[PDB]
């Protein structure tokens, strides 16, 4: 195999022959350099946005992969000029990552239950790494998870304070944001390319009337997501 060993390690983890399985992902996977500015930014985002409710474990970044799915840049082109683009977390089971990288993040099928959703059938993201990391479903006997960083074109956000059955957005709105009691410090936001990265440490949002601990972000069109990084995370349980 021509591929770097961290990429090979990643392919074995995703599938349960290396170069043929890499081809099935339809994704270009580079290893982000550990000393680069990108890696420093990504590690800061992981360190700063680990919440106090989720103190069962600490997170260690093992490998950072830059990912470019085939045709996704072209699919995302209409939304790339849209304002309020953000780099946000999406966690999932390791078993879903073959489908995720080959097909992109999808909205759960019509057959999935509408009742288990805070804000309807969309694609959910967090600005707190520990919120999304819980959706890895890692365990003491299987303590390595995968987590995405997506560029999400949020546009005008419909900002809600409680769970709502959203089937359609108000005119001019492109996404929903559930407002949490705690938020990454908005004065600590940085810009990586044209994308906002909410990597400040947690503070009180000053939104008193809300039932969510942390923010979440939902989009209802799959083309509003451009996947950027895949992190292999070690969960150190307390
Ligand atoms: N996941 C998060 O990081 C996250 C962030 C903020 C907030 C939330 C919170 O989760 C709640 C929703 O969870 P639930 O799994 O019930 O719903 P839902 O998100 O629709 O489940 C579908 C699963 O299918 C995965 N997948 C997507 N594309 C593909 C694909 N091509 N191939 C295969 N699998 C794919 C996806 O990752 C997910 O695990 C929601 O109500 C909200 O409270 C999560």
- Give 92-136 as a DSSP string: E-GGGHHHHHHH-S-PPPTTS-GGG-SSSSSEEEBSSHHHHHGGG
Torsion angle of C-alpha atoms 13, 60, 63, 48, degrees rounded to 10: 130
Q: Give the H or E element holding residue 39.
A: helix 37-48
Q: Please tell me whether residue 209 adopts helix, strand or coil conformation.
A: coil
65: exposed, middle or buried (Cβ count in 10 Å: 0-12, 13-18, 19+): buried
Site to substitute for ligand 1 among 69, 75, 96, most atoms within 8 A of C-beta: 96
Fold category of 1-238 in CATH: Phosphoenolpyruvate Carboxykinase; domain 3 (3.90.228)
- 165 in a labelled binding site: no
Q: Is 34 left (phi over 0), alpha (psi -120 to 50) or beta?
A: alpha
The tokens describing 8, both together, are 């090979």
144 Cα distance to chain centroid: 16
Structural gaps in the chain: residues followed by a C–N separation over 2.5 Å? 16
> What order do you get walking across the sheet with 27-31 strand by strand?
27-31, 57-69, 225-237, 144-153, 85-92, 195-197, 190-192
The residue extents of the domains of the chain are 1-238
Nearest CA to ligand 1 atom 18: 108
- CA-to-CA separations, 20 to 15, 25, 63, 105, 238, in angstroms, rounded: 11, 9, 22, 22, 38
- Tell me, yes or no, if 68 is annotated catalytic: no
The order of strands in the sheet holding 175-178 is 123-125, 216-219, 175-178, 157-160
Enter the resolution in angstroms.
Answer: 2.3
Q: How far is the CA of 143 from the centre of ligand 1 (A)?
A: 20
């Amino acid at each position: 195999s021509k591929l770097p060993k961290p990429v090979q390690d990643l392919i074995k983890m995703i599938f349960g022959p290396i170069d043929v399985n890499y081809e099935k992902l339809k994704t270009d996977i580079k290893v982000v350099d550990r000393d680069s500015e990108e890696a420093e930014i990504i590690r800061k985002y992981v360190k700063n946005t680990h919440a106090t409710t989720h103190n069962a474990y600490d997170l260690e970044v093992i490998d950072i992969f830059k990912i470019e799915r085939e045709g996704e840049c072209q699919r995302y082109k209409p939304f790339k000029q849209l304002h309020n683009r953000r780099l946000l977390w999406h966690g999932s089971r390791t078993t879903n990552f073959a489908g995720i990288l080959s097909q992109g993040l999808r909205i759960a099928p019509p057959e999935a239950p509408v009742t288990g959703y805070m804000f309807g059938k969309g694609i959910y993201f967090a600005d707190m790494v520990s919120k999304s990391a819980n959706y890895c479903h890692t365990s003491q006997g299987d303590p390595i998870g995968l987590i995405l960083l997506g560029e999400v074109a949020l546009g005008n956000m419909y900002e809600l304070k409680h769970a709502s059955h959203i089937s359609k957005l108000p005119k001019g709105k492109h996404s929903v944001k559930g407002l949490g009691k705690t938020t990454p410090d908005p004065s600590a936001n940085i810009s990586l390319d044209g994308v906002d990265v909410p990597l400040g440490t947690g503070i009180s949002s000053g939104v008193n009337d809300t039932s969510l601990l942390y923010n979440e972000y939902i989009v209802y069109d799959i083309a509003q997501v451009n996947l950027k990084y895949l992190l292999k995370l070690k969960f150190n349980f307390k």
